[PDB]
Amino acid sequence: NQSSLLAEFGDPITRVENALQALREGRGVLLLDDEDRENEGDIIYAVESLTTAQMALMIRECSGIVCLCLTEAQADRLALPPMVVNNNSANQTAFTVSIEAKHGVTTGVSAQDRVTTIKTAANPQAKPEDLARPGHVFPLRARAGGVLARRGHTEGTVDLMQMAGLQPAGVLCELTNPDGSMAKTPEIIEFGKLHNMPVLTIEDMVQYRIQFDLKL
């Protein structure tokens, strides 16, 4: 089972604390949502410490559709409305229009270029004109309340940054097996051991936020 498989990463509180410390150290984490939801594990990195090598790993090992999780306030500052008015995706994934840094990039898709765009968008002083649309980074609007309002990786990403005392922006991408199928828990666990990345779940975060009374 999953509870049993994740036991070696510690108990739920420990899994959360280890993930937060990894982010504070500039390392990535692996976040699983509910088994009855997507049942997928995303690599998560903080934007603050994001490097080209970390983006290259996401591209190499994940779906390649690398998303930028923002607060509603930051997406509003950037003038990024939802990509679609009537979202009928299964989870109502909150894609805004896609973005490219207006300056400092070329075609936008290289690992370096994606980082430039992400840092440009996540800048607390950013303005809409700093970003061209469309582009090759995919922002996502986290719901107010985080994982206590919506049990998505989007909310998990922003909550992890806030809980770790980091600027409230992170990137995510779904871990993919070489044959193109999506990684499930055993493969996620093995990837996290290989890359020294903590694994935790949305359920871990929810019970952690409830018990420590963690508004954000």
Added chain:
Amino acid sequence: NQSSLLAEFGDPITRVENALQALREGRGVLLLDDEDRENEGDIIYAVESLTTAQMALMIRECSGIVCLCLTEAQADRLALPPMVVNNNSANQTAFTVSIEAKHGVTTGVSAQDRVTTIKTAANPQAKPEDLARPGHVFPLRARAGGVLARRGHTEGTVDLMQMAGLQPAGVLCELTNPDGSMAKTPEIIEFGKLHNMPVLTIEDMVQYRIQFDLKL
């Protein structure tokens, strides 16, 4: 130089003919745009013969942002308007809203799921309701006239299918080096030898279409 490097794939007419034959055989090709444009090589596959293994290779080896090149007529049939009204991307890349098959998929990102979405969208009998929006496949509207009107990989993709007598839909994705930088011509050539994929350029296609008087 590039002319010299591609000489081993044949002369320009031969490079085009070999690419067309590969597509007819269900194989992929590598298309380079102008050195002074993106200077990137895209893997191209025909939708008609697209397999999970081909999609997995694109995800593994390319940017992961896999695009579906459609005619204007097919995008209109699907009710896919441009993603952004005032496109200010550098090349005015003609992204529509992103799409997911409404049925037959789960999270949409697995290689199989992307193929299901692509085949669903490319179906000559498709209807808008067959696709959820947003999603994890990125359609692109090819300009009328193809590479004789716009020298993009988008037009190259649809033109190649039409020139090969295939249904006029193809997928593309930018070849990426493991370190996250974008592949340039020497790496593209080496990838095409490794994977038995012909390499050709947009310039090859333009002069080919002009000289053989090829409306499409």
